[PDB]
Each structure stands twice: as C-alpha cells, then as structure tokens.
C-alpha cells in the first residue's frame, strides 16, 4: 500500500510546530486539532500518511491571470497530495475541482478588533474610514467578500481591494498581529474558529464582535477519482457521531485557554 | 428524457405545513414552508419539475432491528418509491451508507424544551432527577444518538428513557410540543435546535429552549444511490448558501414570522 500524502497547513490550534521540533522528525513535529484528526481518519481508514506543510502557505485560489491553483487546493489538483486535512472551507468552485467530506467543523465569517475598537458590525465597518480593515490573500474570505452582492459586503469590498497600503496578509499570525500593533485602527475579518481561539489566547487584548456573516464548514478534501472519498466521509461522519470532534474541539481550544479558510 | 420529480418531506413547521386555504388547492401549492422554497430553489438551479409528496408513515427513518426494513423518508428513497427528500433530514453514518446526502444546508444539535419556568437548566440536570420525565421523537436520529451515545450523562438518560412507563416517546414533533405544555413542567422534550427555536417564537409563548446543545450535525437533501440528481443538487446547496439565499429563508420562516415579537 502508499503512504497517503496529507497536505496542511500551519494554522493554530489547527496545525503547529512542537516544542523542539527542530529535532524531531516526519509527523512528530506537529501538533493541534488536525494533527490529532489526521490520526483519527487514518485509524478508521487503515492508512499510513505523511503529513507536508503547503510549500506556500496558502489555503488556495485560483489566479485571474492563468487559472493556475495556488495553495493546499492545488497541492490536491495537480496530483502533489492525496488528502488534504486542514480548516480548508468548502466552497462551490472548490467543490467544482476537489472533493470535500461531510463538514467535520462549523464557522462563519467573523470580526476581530482590539478590544476596546468603536465597531460591533460589518455595516459598522462599511460606514467609516478612520479604521482600515482586511482579509487573509488566497482564502475563501477574501472571495467572499470579492462576489458577495450583498450591499455592506460589496461595499466593503470596493475598500479592501483598492486600500493602500495593502489591507490584505499572507497568514492569519501576520493579521492577528496587525490588529494588536494598530492601536485599535486595524480590524481584520476571519473565520470565527480561528477568532475565538485567538480570544483565549495572552495578551487577551482582542475580541469577536457581532455575528457571523455567513455560515460554512471545513471538510476533509480529495482529489477526483480518489479511492479514499468514501473511507474518509464515513470517518467523519463515525467521528461526530462518537462525539471525537467535540473532545478534540474541547482540547485545542478550551482546554488551551489563558484568558479566563 | 424528462419525467417529473417525485419529493418525499414531511409536515413539519416551518419546513412544510398546510396553505391556509390548502383544500381549495392541488399539488405543491396546497403547502408552504422552508422546504417548500427550498425545493423550489433546487428544482430551478437543477431545471427540474417536482412533485412534492408527504411521507405515508410520517416517519424520518430508522431501520427496524426484527424485520431490518426502512421506514419514513428514508424508506422511501431506498426503496425507489421517491426520487428526493427535501426536509429537515439528518445528515448519519448509518443513512449515509443506504442513501447520499448533499452537504448540509443547515445546522442543528439536539437541544431541550422545557415549559417556562421548569427548573431544569441541561441535560445533567434532567439525569440527576426522577420528578420531570423526559423523551424524543420515535423513528428520527435524536432517539438513535441516545441509544448509541457512551457518554455517561447520556447513556443514563436513554436507560431512563427506554424503560420509561408510561412511554416518553412521541410519533411527531408536535405530540412533543403538546406534551410539554400539557404537564405543568413534568415532561421535558429533547428536540433539534432548529424546531425548539422555531417553537419558542411561537404563541402561548409558554416553552423555552434550554442548555448547550448536546451535539452538532446538519440537514442535507437526500437522494438514492445511483441517482443522477445527485451532483448538481449537491451544488445548488452550495450555490444556495453562498449567495445567501438560505439565510434569506430562514429568517422568512424562523424570525419573519415570531408570533412573540431528525
Ligand atoms: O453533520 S455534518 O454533515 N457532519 C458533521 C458536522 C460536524 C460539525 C458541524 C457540521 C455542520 C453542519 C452544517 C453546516 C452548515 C450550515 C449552513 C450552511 C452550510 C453548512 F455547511 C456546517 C457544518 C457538521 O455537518
Ligand atoms: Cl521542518
Ligand atoms: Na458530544
């Protein structure tokens, strides 16, 4: 049999580096919810995997110019990888080109500000100019906001895409940092699992205003054709069901609080 | 070629219930619901023609364990006596393995209603006590989740639950809600979310949903094995979800509507 290739990506508490990984090797240097999920599917599943970091770092886009997919979706496309277990968001396009397992996690779109920001809304953000605001690049956020007809949501489009500086990172670490270094004049909007695991995290200085702006899972994903598509949905699926992904949620999560894509 | 669509749902507010005026009029436009416009949506993005078609028994679906055959909605896609369920369907592994499911177009867990002022708070408190007896709906996936959960609170309440006398077992949501109300805070009913929710909006106004909800799943629409429906429902949900159009329903059925403004 192969050893099952799984791409991921670093994102806490998702996937992370351990302690003094610099010595330690192959899936032992990562931690986190999908480092423990990745074991679970592979148990029900009978594989042996490899998990591999997405040499760009991204979730996965696909570019307007060449129509070539970027990150961890074109890791799956172009044949690099043969699952991909991560908070990858299933989407419509991506479900046009890859396969997703029942959803193993909810999340919507969501708010950060440092604590204390005047904004509790979306349409809260549309109506000023004072605080600037983004979106992770390559991302099902950032293209969210790209075709949403929705007024606020076009209209906060229309701002991030012509923002300079850049309104936009490349890792949700580099917009978390911007909303704690902007003195309360950078909001960044990401998926609401990652916001609130952020919100437990030292120095607590951030928080998750108002609600959700849409309402999506993650899904384990697969190349068409790919023999593992059932095996990996009924695990889910098996998953939920034996209450696993509560404890794992639980445990990386909550469990890990310090304050108390 | 192209022959009509056979939808299995199933009367359950606010996903499929009866027009005001129902008995001046025939097929799909006797009902009016969630599901309703639902269908309607799907049907338009897949460019399909439908029946909608209430579920006989007025079941969901489980699996008898003598005889090992299907009933409810689930019976009749397996069965081939229809094409498509459109209803407030619980996404499972063990329907999974029979029928496929499109990725879920709502979210849901099982949830507790208590009549106001019930001194029960979580499911916890309902296994700790013998005054306030408690039940599910028979034949759906919430009495399922208690007979095979082994988590302790839980396996206690369906040891409770299965031995019960009299029965704490309702056959429709609705006997559930009645029974609620009925027993001046005796009998509490565990529910999905969604219809807790959609109940406590609705006049006396006298129930009120309780506690976290005990899991997370989802809905999907339902189609048998082989179906060719399947792909292109699965990404009119998706479709569907992104444009905000379910969203858009919910709210019409859920929040439009507050009468206290499986
Ligand atoms: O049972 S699932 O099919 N499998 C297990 C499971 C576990 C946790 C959460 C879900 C889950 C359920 C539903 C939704 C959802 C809701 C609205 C629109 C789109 C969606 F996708 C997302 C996620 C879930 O769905
Ligand atoms: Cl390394
Ligand atoms: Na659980």
Not at 150 to 167: G, H, L, N, Q
């Amino acid at each position: 049999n192969k050893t099952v290739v799984v791409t991921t990506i670093l994102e806490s508490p998702y996937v992370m580096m351990k302690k003094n990984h610099e010595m330690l090797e192959g899936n032992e240097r990562y931690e986190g919810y999908c480092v423990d999920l990745a074991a679970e599917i592979a148990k029900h599943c009978g594989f042996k995997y490899k998990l591999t970091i997405v040499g760009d770092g991204k979730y996965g886009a696909r570019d307007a110019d060449t129509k070539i997919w970027n990150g961890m979706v074109g890791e799956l496309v172009y044949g690099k990888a043969d699952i991909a277990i991560a908070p990858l968001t299933i989407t419509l396009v991506r479900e046009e080109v890859i396969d997703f397992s029942k959803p193993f996690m909810s999340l919507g779109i969501s708010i950060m500000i440092k604590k204390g920001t005047p904004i509790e809304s979306a349409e809260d953000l549309s109506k000023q100019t004072e605080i600037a605001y983004g979106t992770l690049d390559s991302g099902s956020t950032k293209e969210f906001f790209r075709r949403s007809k929705i007024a606020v949501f076009d209209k906060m489009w229309t701002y991030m895409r012509s923002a300079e500086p850049s309104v936009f990172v490349r890792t949700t670490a580099e917009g978390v940092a911007r909303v704690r270094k902007s003195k309360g004049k950078y909001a960044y909007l990401l998926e609401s699992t990652m916001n609130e695991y952020i919100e437990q995290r030292k120095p607590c200085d951030t928080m998750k205003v108002g609600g959700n702006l849409d309402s999506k899972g993650y899904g384990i994903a697969t190349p068409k054709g790919s023999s593992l598509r059932t095996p990996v949905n009924l695990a889910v699926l098996k998953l939920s069901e034996q209450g696993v992904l509560d404890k794992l949620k639980n445990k990386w999560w909550y469990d890990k609080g310090e304050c108390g894509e």
